[PDB]
Amino acid sequence: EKLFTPLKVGAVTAPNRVFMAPLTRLRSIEPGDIPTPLMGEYYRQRASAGLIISEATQISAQAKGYAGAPGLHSPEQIAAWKKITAGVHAEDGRIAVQLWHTGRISHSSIQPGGQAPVSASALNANTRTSLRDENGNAIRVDTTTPRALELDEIPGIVNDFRQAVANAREAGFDLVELHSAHGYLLHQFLSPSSNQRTDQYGGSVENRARLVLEVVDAVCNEWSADRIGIRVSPIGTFQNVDNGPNEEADALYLIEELAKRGIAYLHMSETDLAGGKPYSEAFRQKVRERFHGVIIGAGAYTAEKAEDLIGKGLIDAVAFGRDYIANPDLVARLQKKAELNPQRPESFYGGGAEGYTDYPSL
């Protein structure tokens, strides 16, 4: 078994390769999109993870697409996250913040000024996001048609990611994970399906990857390359965003570019909850020979699959999502071959302590 051996992940050393995937739980305070002590307790309970990757967190107010998702742009958010990371560190854990802009997976009612959300192009996501009703409960609502960003708005987006990374470093996070997956803003630019621009940010794969690479360069300069990870979902379809007609070649282009920056890790989200075709071993080999940081695999993994791929030299770590919702001590359970707590999906999104901090350890 290799799952319980250490791994250098850029600037930090994980004691095991069982990571907690980023999980939106929609329990932040509104107004202000403020993280809470309850959230702090949830993360503290999971501090034995080799690395905790936080729920997706807004880089700016404009970034918001879900009611109850936290930000990392305001003083009050910074102050609240400081307490949370301190708690994780007091339990000898490590925590990365996943930073997003939701782009078109959003709703005008939660945007600044009540305006349409922004994207690469003015194309509706044709999916739903999660808002809150008058009683504060999560509700699924159709996404608002976005406004295409003007060319002169692009530098501001890059700066928002940079600023959020400055704030993250101050807030005590050990690493940052850029959310370049799942049909959110960075992926909206990457994918031909959502990007019909005819300027330097659309068309060719070079142009489609331009924004994400500008963001990577800006955040490496703000902090250090060994503090930066990125999550991609570059094969298949996620929330109606496919990866275009040349998905493998386009993915390898992006990955070779990322490798040049010497970033800490590449986190590949391989499938959504409905599943689909597995990654080919040939594709995994092509990724591995191009990227010289840590590779994290995710998407309906088992410990046995993680061991197999780690043993084959193709990935370095695995991120578990739903098993981490339900098992604060997932590391110990996998080490001991113990049963896993029964998941309660009705309390994944919104609410309070129930279905959040009440799953027991062994």
Ligand X SMILES: Cc1cc2nc3c(=O)[nH]c(=O)nc-3n(C[C@H](O)[C@H](O)[C@H](O)COP(=O)(O)O)c2cc1C
Per CB under 6 A, residues contacting ligand P81 are 24, 26, 56, 66, 130, 182, 349
Is 179 part of any known ligand binding site? yes
Reported residue count of the chain is 362
Cis preceding linkage at 31, omega within 30: yes
Q: Which does 47 bind (CB under 5 to 8 A by kind): ligand X, ligand P81, none?
A: none
Q: Give the residue from 125, 121, 107 showing the smallest Cα distance to 64.
A: 107
66 binds, among ligand P81, ligand X, none (CB under 5 to 8 A by kind): ligand P81
The minimum distance between CB 342 and ligand P81, in angstroms, equals 20
Q: What is the set of active-site residues?
A: 184
Cβ closest to ligand X, residue 118 vs residue 181: 181
Q: Which is nearer to ligand P81, 178 or 252 (CB)?
A: 178
Q: Considering the complex, state which of residue 166 and residue 300 has its C-beta at the smaller distance from ligand X.
A: 300
Q: Is 100 in contact with 182 (CB distance < 8 Å)?
A: no
Nearest to 178 by CA among 59, 16, 272: 59
* 24 is annotated as contributing to ligand binding: yes
CA distance 31 to 82: 19
The nearer residue to ligand X, 207 or 343, going by C-beta atoms, is 343
Q: Which residue shows structure tokens 């936290």? A: 70
Strand pairing report for 7-9 and 12-14: antiparallel
CB nearer to ligand X: give 183 or 202: 183
Cα separation, 314 vs 294, in Å, equals: 10
Consult the annotation and say whether 311 binds a ligand. no
What's the closest the beta carbon of residue 65 comes to ligand P81, in angstroms?
9
Instruction: Determine contact, residues 220/228, Cβ cutoff 8 Å.
Output: yes
Q: Which residue is closest to ligand X by CB?
A: 321
- Please give the helix or strand (H or E) that residue 147 lies within, else none: strand 147-148
Scan for tokens 């302590």, then name that residue.
353
Of ligand P81, ligand X, none, which one does residue 130 interact with (CB within 5 to 8 Å by kind)? ligand P81
CA separation for the pair 302, 308 (Å, rounded): 10
- Give the separation between CA 132 and CA 93, rounded to whole angstroms: 32
Residue 322 interaction partner, one of ligand X, ligand P81, none, beta carbon < 5-8 Å per kind = ligand X
Q: Which is nearer to ligand P81, 26 or 186 (CB)?
A: 26
Which one-letter amino acid corresponds to residue 255?
A: I
Query: Beta 95-100 vs 118-119: how paired, if at all?
Result: unpaired
Residue 320 contact partner, candidates ligand X, ligand P81, none, CB within 5 to 8 A by sort of partner: ligand X
CB of residue 182 to ligand P81, shortest distance in Å:
4
Whether 56 has a binding-site annotation, put simply, is: yes
Q: Is 90 annotated as a binding residue?
A: no
322 is in an annotated binding site: yes
Closest CB 66 distance from ligand P81, rounded Å: 5
Cα angle for residues 193, 23, 277 (degrees, 5° grid): 50
Measured from the CB of residue 197, what is the shortest distance to ligand X in angstroms? 24
Is residue 44 a known part of a binding site?
Answer: no
Residue 300 marked in a binding site:
yes
Q: Alpha carbon 25 to chain centroid distance?
A: 13
Q: Which does 18 bind (CB under 5 to 8 A by kind): ligand X, ligand P81, none?
A: none
Structure tokens at 102: 């939701």
- C-alpha–C-alpha distance, residues 71 and 318, integer Å: 26
Residues 6+ positions from 308 with CB-CB distance below 8 Å: none
Give the shortest CB-194-to-ligand P81 separation in angstroms.
15
CA distances from residue 172 to 14, 36, 95 in whole angstroms, order as listed: 17, 16, 9
Chain positions contacting ligand X, by CB under 6 A: 21-24, 55-56, 98, 179, 181-182, 231, 269, 298-301, 320-323, 348
**Residues in binding site for progesterone:** 140, 179, 182
**Residues in binding site for FMNH2:** 22, 24, 56, 98, 231, 300, 321-322
**Residues in binding site:** 22, 24, 56, 98, 140, 179, 182, 231, 300, 321-322
**Residues in binding site for FMN:** 22, 24, 56, 98, 182, 231, 300, 321-322
